[PDB]
Write a protein that binds this ligand. Structure first.
Ligand SMILES: *C(=O)[C@@H](NC=O)[C@@H]1N=C(C(=O)O)/C(=C/OC(C)=O)CS1
Ligand SMILES: *C(=O)[C@@H](NC=O)[C@@H]1N=C(C(=O)O)/C(=C/OC(C)=O)CS1
Lengths: 358, 356
């Protein structure tokens, strides 16, 4: 790596790991379009297995960026429209509160207060229909953004209905394969288990538990190499050969709603660059990031803005992830750890690094 | 051309020219991506000059397709947003009816009843300001569509302000040049007058008159070759090398509003394909039809299975362009008489339906 990349990464990430007591960490910096990789510590503390370029980490809510782009691709294929009623694709969802809730509201957490989590007790398809049929909204559609796994989770499940493919099969064949993400999985197969990091929570080794709509909201596992490729793809979508995927990545960075200084994409969130770092740093703390906020519709949505900070945080019980990039600067960063440590500390580190390099 | 293309075109266009008494016509069929050209009759009856592939015709309102694409390319550049208020780009528009009227409303005829024509007495840009300030909407913004040159014409004018270029210069540098439309003009240069057809209105030779926002709403002249290249560009925007233009073409074919079976783009109008030919044939015809619109929220990106089209007339010319992206199929009809729109649509549908 150029010395200026090594110096700012070492000075920022290495101390963060000490401060947060992170067992293992991989970071990619994309600089003038090319990836540079850094690794620390252990994937599995008991085995003393080092983090490598092949180590798979739980991306947690970073998965929503794959879901947003898979939906973007289905729109480009003309299979779905974000203006369509949710009930077009789930004809069994007939209760009256759903009138007026569209795929756009599910994808952007604006349906009117669908809950942060799908309840743990929901296990079957039948449980899931009953939970949505029984949900009562806190606000009208398209008035309030409330971050919610049960919102974008349902979007992803419905987006793939026209294709007839399972969500996993659509994600593999339409997104992971065309981008050569060859070590990225919704369900880690036996061959990859030896590379699958353990997460650490209260010192115990953990992996995420099965949950309804887990694949669509928080279920992707990936390596630092494949996430570097994912950043590159989202930095420069016109390089992607497959027309509908190139389109889908562009649609996932369109600005659909504005709250404060952020804009909501499909999975991705965006702010103009240069950003106020205190804004993304404080905004990432869960007391703000999970609060309801009033949205202004952006009518029609602004196409992807090059001069943006585009980012997403993600956590599972044992893992904490962050991805951020600025298309205009051909610059990005991926940070994967096998401990769930506070968001502001991720955003602050990533900001220090990217701001040094632009 | 392949004998089947030849035969469908000639058995359609021959009787059209006879029945409508058209003095000169040029047609291009785009079939599997490649252009095939046909020409008939006279560009200049008095001078006995035939229509050729280099004859310029007035496109009339087909010019709005170039204005919608130039707008789409300005949005792709980040210079404007369709969600911007009009007053952002013309802050002298202080009259209170302008609050809430966006560039999207201007581009799609939904501002609330701006009129079809800018009145003839509007010359200067101060007369133009006074016209817009004094205009009284019939409706709230985004509730009814009323086709209007004064609506998309102002959109064209404002969309280029951040660029710092004249509308003509932006159109030249950002659309005509990149697409090698080198015989397409807002103002026909002296060197190209020998190729400018006359239009014919009641047997008299006529050309379009200057008027305010003419360039933006109805003032482009072009050849059948350059119009075939325009149709190719709109059929396959992914082949275009300039990234903002490729995107601008896509934005112009997004579906912003629905009324009946038709969707409004930026300049272009679209229907799902296959189309009921009655929907487009009668649909193309009335001096004012005000139609309620449903917003497409958010707009649908350009749908490949569409019949995408635009009609156009000036006092002496009648033009039509239609294409179907998923079949790589298109047609351009240019004539130097303004004959009824249903006759245009009917011919076009009878040709393209036969070729797919
Ligand atoms: C995605 O990461 C998702 N959690 C998935 O398991 C979101 N991120 C959170 C976080 O940043 O920590 C969430 C914490 O939720 C709480 C504190 O209840 C949940 S939503
Ligand atoms: C463009 O062609 C424009 N005339 C410009 O000089 C419009 N042309 C019409 C037409 O195609 O005949 C118009 C019909 O008006 C309606 C009701 O759409 C509008 S003026």
């Amino acid at each position: 790596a150029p010395q200026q990349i090594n110096d700012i990464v070492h000075r920022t990430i290495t101390p963060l790991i000490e401060q947060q007591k992170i067992p293992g960490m991989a970071v990619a910096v994309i600089y003038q379009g090319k990836p540079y990789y850094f690794t620390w510590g252990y994937a599995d503390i008991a085995k003393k297995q080092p983090v490598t370029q092949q180590t798979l980490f739980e991306l947690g809510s970073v998965s929503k960026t794959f879901t947003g782009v898979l939906g973007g691709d289905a729109i480009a294929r003309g299979e779905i429209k974000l203006s369509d009623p949710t009930t077009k694709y789930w004809p069994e969802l007939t209760a009256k509160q759903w009138n007026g809730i569209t795929l756009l509201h599910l994808a952007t957490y604006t349906a009117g207060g669908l809950p942060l989590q799908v309840p743990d007790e929901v296990k079957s398809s039948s449980d899931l229909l009953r939970f949505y049929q029984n949900w009562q909204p806190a606000w009208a559609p398209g008035t309030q953004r409330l971050y919610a796994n049960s919102s974008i989770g349902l979007f992803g499940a419905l987006a793939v209905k026209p294709s007839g493919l399972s969500f996993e099969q659509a994600m593999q064949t339409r997104v992971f394969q065309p981008l050569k993400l060859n070590h990225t999985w919704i369900n880690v197969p036996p061959a990859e288990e030896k590379n699958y990091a353990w997460g650490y929570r209260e010192g115990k080794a953990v992996h995420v538990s099965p949950g309804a709509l887990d694949a669509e909201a928080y279920g992707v596992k990936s390596t630092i190499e494949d996430m570097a490729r994912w950043v590159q793809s989202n930095l420069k979508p016109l390089d992607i050969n497959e027309k509908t995927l190139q389109q889908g990545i562009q649609l996932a960075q369109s600005r659909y709603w504005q709250t404060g200084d952020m804009y909501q994409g499909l999975g991705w969130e965006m702010l103009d660059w240069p950003v106020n770092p205190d804004s993304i740093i404080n905004g990432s703390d869960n007391k703000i990031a999970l609060a309801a906020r009033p949205v202004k519709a952006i009518t029609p949505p602004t196409p992807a803005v090059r001069a943006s900070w585009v980012h997403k945080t993600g956590a599972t019980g044992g893992f904490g992830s962050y991805v951020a990039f600025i298309p205009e600067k051909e610059l990005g960063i991926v940070m994967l750890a096998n401990k769930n440590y506070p968001n502001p500390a991720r955003v602050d580190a990533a900001w220090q690094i990217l701001n040094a390099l632009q």
